[PDB]
Structure 1
Amino acid sequence: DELLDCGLLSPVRAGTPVEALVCDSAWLQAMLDAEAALTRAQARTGFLPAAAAEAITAAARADRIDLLAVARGARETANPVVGLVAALTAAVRRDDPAAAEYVHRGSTSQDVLDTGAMLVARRALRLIGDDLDRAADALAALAADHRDTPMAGRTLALHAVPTTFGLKAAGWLELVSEAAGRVARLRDGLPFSLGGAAGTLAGYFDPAVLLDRLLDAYAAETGLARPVLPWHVLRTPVADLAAVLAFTAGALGKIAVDVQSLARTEVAEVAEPRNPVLSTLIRSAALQVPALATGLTQCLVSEDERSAGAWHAEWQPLRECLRLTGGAARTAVELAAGLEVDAARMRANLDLTDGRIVSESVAVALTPLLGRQAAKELLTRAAFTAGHEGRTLGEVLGELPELDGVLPKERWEALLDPARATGVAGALVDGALARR
């Protein structure tokens, strides 16, 4: 039928857990959760009877509600909360006519919708963070295992100097760990929305005493944070979600394009657990989320006490950012857990420039006996000459009169070995891993 979203156009998240958390029914449920938490908190502060709150809570179930009718009725007010409230009120009235007068008491559409949005975000970010933690575990393992696995460092698409795959993986780990930390902190900071019609909370009511009691109760009932001010037009939580999800998707995209560079036919230094489809999916989300994030970020420009459109522009892209990033994280776990590292092919590929990739380290080694300027000039000359003649760097070095007898044979064998010129990659990996 025409109502099914199966993820047909978005394989990066199709079949992944985040789908179930951010589908339309889950958002309907989140808005019902926000209503019932509102009633319960109002009862806890004395504004209505506890039994009416229990009845509303019991009726506040997505299966009591006609999802399609609510969605299709929203065009009349440009949001779904008026229809939702009517449906919940009828559902409560069926079982408890006294309780129905307290459904949505003193409230406004945006408190319920935004509170539900932060509930959905909070649950979805719990999943994204747990997946980022698993990915980080597999990456830290790859980093420790390959601390001493040499490979060609590549800059501007060409071999530069040798590095280690452990160092590369530790950069991956650094990105994923940063993302998981930001996801956790953002999750702990998402607030409820309790402002009333235009942010004065007039319908919900020393004014300071009652404000404090109600705000504490609604924090307790929702599990969300208490904000200093109603934020109907202070869209900091939405901008923060946009920033954190675009950072996360971009970091995973970094891992994805590195994997694709290593996995291509004529490199073949890693393989995915034979197209590299996992990195293709991660990359697909990486090319989508930042553009959605900029629309989210632009909605900070929200006029008056409720914008005539900029708030409405937030819901779908936010959901999609949660969905895509969720898929990408799940896919990243599969990638980092399953990556196949071909150390021997990395070692072989180190020889592709016929010694030129160690010329910097040879220049350094010759600096005590030649000077820095003379050694650098001699080595760039030898690298060019070896490139033209299709000979090894060491071959051209063994023909320059200036180098005759300059170093013992064994030291030359050590110097021209690409696997030994990795700088301090080992110490850097140790330092990154001690942070865990």
Structure 2
Amino acid sequence: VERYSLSPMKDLWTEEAKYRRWLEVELAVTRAYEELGMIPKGVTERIRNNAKIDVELFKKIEEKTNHDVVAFVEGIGSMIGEDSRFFHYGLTSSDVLDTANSLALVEAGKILLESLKEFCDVLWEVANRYKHTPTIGRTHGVHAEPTSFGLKVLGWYSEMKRNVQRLERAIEEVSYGKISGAVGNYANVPPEVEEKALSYLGLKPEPVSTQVVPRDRHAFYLSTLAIVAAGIERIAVEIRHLQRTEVLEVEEPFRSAMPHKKNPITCERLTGLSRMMRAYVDPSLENIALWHERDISHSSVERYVFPDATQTLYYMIVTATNVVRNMKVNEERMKKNIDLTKGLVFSQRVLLKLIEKGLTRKEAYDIVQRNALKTWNSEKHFLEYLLEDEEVKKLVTKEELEELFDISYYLKHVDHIFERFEK
């Protein structure tokens, strides 16, 4: 794990950061009471001045207390003297816990969103750089028709922009806390305190909560994270295919190294991390069916999944940004790979042209097949066989024949497509 904790994301998930979120919540709540005239003026400022985050103290108290937030509430109690009457007043532990996890997931979502937007900018730049670079399109791993390498990157760009909007909605979904007390009905803490306290944190009130924020929001967020990761996985698998020794179209950045031993190690790592990101979706979905007004089975799951899902995805986005930013792209090898089958890429164009000139689907098909076959089993090109085919010679001119091998045919609509992403 520590392998991919990267700053800013990993600073979110220390024990200090967590206790500071709990204090933030507690201070928003005393502030809300005080602004409503419900506790004396001055309480919040004094608790702000005297409450310190002391991790060892809270952990020592927790040894005796066996309860994380009660230990915190007493630890803070021992620094704030008389003001402890007004601290954690009416709250249940999950008011603090779940509001603090909204804070963390919203912030993690924002870090993720900024790095994602940055991945989009790099993908847009790389797609425009190779906008007109010819490459062979491949279906079932088999040469199909010519295309451009910028258009392939644009498909990745297109997918990551759908993920920017998805990530914005997942941030919205998790932007809800609760300050509603034991079973969520404001018996011990007024709903006006909740509304003020959460607006100071940048959060909204869960419209109806139980003891807990409903876990379908978290499952939505984490399902969105797994889908972002699988798009990065699609990119990573492409580059693994393109860096294989028989292809050599692209090379992921590295580190003088042996030219024949450049392994796509980073993209293999990305593929494995995507497997982990989708692994967290299932446990988040059966966190949803909590018993009544809550059970705590989700808590242990979330200790793994919140920190690991958001730190792994962050590492995936930053790493894949660097891979696409700095990968070597071998344009001449791309172009050369179009001629690997020696013209047989243009074999549909040749087939149709024989139907145009009179022949029936089957008639044309047999002429192309025989030429294909000879091309495939030898060293001469498809075109050179077609030109010498007598049946072809009485139906098609030679200038007609040669123009069917123009790559620009496959390429006439690339700008049309790029233009859909402009402006």
In the superposition, the TM-score normalised over structure 1's length comes to 0.87
Q: Partner residue of 2:283?
A: 295
Change (3 A) 1:74 1:314: farther
Does residue 125 (structure 1) correspond to residue 109 (structure 2)? The answer is yes
Change (3 A) 1:334 1:68: farther
Q: Partner residue of 1:261?
A: 241
Q: Which amino acid aligns with 2:189?
A: Y
Cα distance in 2 for partners of 1:41, 1:372 equals 79
Identity, in percent, stands at 26
Does residue 412 (structure 1) correspond to residue 392 (structure 2)? The answer is no
Q: Partner residue of 1:3?
A: none
Q: Partner residue of 1:238?
A: 218
Q: Partner residue of 2:257?
A: none
Change (3 A) 1:118 1:137: same
Does residue 384 (structure 1) correspond to residue 368 (structure 2)? The answer is no
Determine which of 34, 48, 53 is the counterpart of 1:57: 48
Q: Which amino acid aligns with 1:359?
A: S
Change (3 A) 1:413 1:336: same
8 Å Cα contact 2:113-2:164 kept in structure 1: yes
Q: Partner residue of 1:208?
A: none
Does residue 216 (structure 1) correspond to residue 201 (structure 2)? The answer is no
Q: Which amino acid aligns with 1:241?
A: Y
8 Å Cα contact 1:249-1:286 kept in structure 2: yes
Does residue 106 (structure 1) correspond to residue 76 (structure 2)? The answer is no
Does residue 76 (structure 1) correspond to residue 55 (structure 2)? The answer is no
Change (3 A) 1:424 1:236: farther
Query: Residue 83 of structure 1: CA displacement?
Result: 1.7
Does residue 45 (structure 1) correspond to residue 36 (structure 2)? The answer is yes
Q: Partner residue of 1:346?
A: 334
Q: Partner residue of 2:386?
A: 397
Does residue 200 (structure 1) correspond to residue 185 (structure 2)? The answer is yes
Cα distance in 2 for partners of 1:74, 1:193 equals 28
- Unaligned residue ranges in structure 2 (runs of 5+): 254-261
Query: Residue 168 of structure 1: CA displacement?
Result: 0.6
Cα distance in 2 for partners of 1:40, 1:141 equals 47
Change (3 A) 1:389 1:229: same
- Unaligned residue ranges in structure 1 (runs of 5+): 1-6, 206-210
Does residue 173 (structure 1) correspond to residue 157 (structure 2)? The answer is yes
Cα distance in 2 for partners of 1:67, 1:367 equals 85
What whole-Å deviation, never above 9, does each CA across 1:319-339 have from its counterpart, x for those lacking one? 211110111111122122222
Cα distance in 1 for partners of 2:290, 2:399 equals 71
Q: CA RMSD in A?
A: 2.5
Query: Residue 233 of structure 1: CA displacement?
Result: 6.0
Determine which of 2, 12, 22 is the counterpart of 1:31: 22
8 Å Cα contact 1:170-1:429 kept in structure 2: no
8 Å Cα contact 2:61-2:75 kept in structure 1: no
User: Greater shift after overlay, 399-408 or 214-223?
Assistant: 399-408
Counterpart mapping for 1:356-375 below 5 A: 356-369=344-357, 370-375=359-364
8 Å Cα contact 2:218-2:284 kept in structure 1: yes
Query: Residue 226 of structure 1: CA displacement?
Result: 2.7
Query: Residue 154 of structure 1: CA displacement?
Result: 1.3
Cα distance in 1 for partners of 2:300, 2:183 equals 16
What whole-Å deviation, never above 9, does each CA across 1:90-122 have from its counterpart, x for those lacking one? 232xxxx12122221111111111111111111
Cα distance in 2 for partners of 1:163, 1:214 equals 60
8 Å Cα contact 1:143-1:429 kept in structure 2: no
8 Å Cα contact 2:57-2:75 kept in structure 1: no
What whole-Å deviation, never above 9, does each CA across 1:53-95 have from its counterpart, x for those lacking one? 2223344543x33277179649934xx2222222222232xxx
Q: Partner residue of 2:206?
A: 227
Higher RCO by CA contacts (8 Å cutoff, separation 6 or greater):
1
In the superposition, the TM-score normalised over structure 2's length comes to 0.89
Q: Partner residue of 2:258?
A: none
Query: Residue 17 of structure 1: CA displacement?
Result: 2.8
